Design a protein around this ligand. Sequence first.
Ligand SMILES: [Zn+2]
Ligand SMILES: [Zn+2]
Length: 74
Amino acid sequence: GSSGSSGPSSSQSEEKAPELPKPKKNRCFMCRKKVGLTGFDCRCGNLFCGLHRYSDKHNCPYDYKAEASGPSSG
Ligand SMILES: [Zn+2]
Ligand SMILES: [Zn+2]
C-alpha cells in the first residue's frame, strides 16, 4: 500500500469506467450485438448472433467449407 505522488503534479482526469471490453462479451463478432444464449460459434473461432453465423455473411476466413468433402477447386 502506497500513495505514490509524483509529477505531473496537476491532474484533471479520473472517473469510474467499465472493465476493459472482453474479446467476446457474449456479443456478435460481426455486428457486435447482445446474443448471450442466442449466440453462434463459427469454425473460424468467432461468435455470431446467428444472423451472420453463415460463412458468406460475415466473410468467414475459414475454409472448412472447401476443406472436407469439398473438392471444389479453390
Ligand atoms: Zn450479428
Ligand atoms: Zn466464421
